[PDB]
Amino acid sequence: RQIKIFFQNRRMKFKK
C-alpha cells in the first residue's frame, strides 16, 4: 500500500 510505493517508486518506475 505504501512501503512498496516508497520502493516501487524506484522498482516499477525504474522500468515503467
Q: Cα–Cα distance between 11 and 3 in angstroms, integer?
A: 12
13 grid coordinates: 518506475
Residue with cell 500500500: 1
Q: How many angstroms from the chain centroid is the CA of residue 14?
A: 8
Q: Cα–Cα distance between 7 and 14 in angstroms, integer?
A: 10
Residue 3, phi then psi, degrees to nearest 5:
-40, -45
- What is the identity of the amino acid at 13? K
Q: Cα–Cα distance between 16 and 13 in angstroms, integer?
A: 5
Contacts (Cβ under 8 Å, ≥6 apart) of 4: 11
Way it was determined = NMR
Which helix H or strand E contains 6, and what residues bound it?
A: helix 3-11
Q: How many angstroms from the chain centroid is the CA of residue 5?
A: 5
Residue 11, phi then psi, degrees to nearest 5:
-115, -50
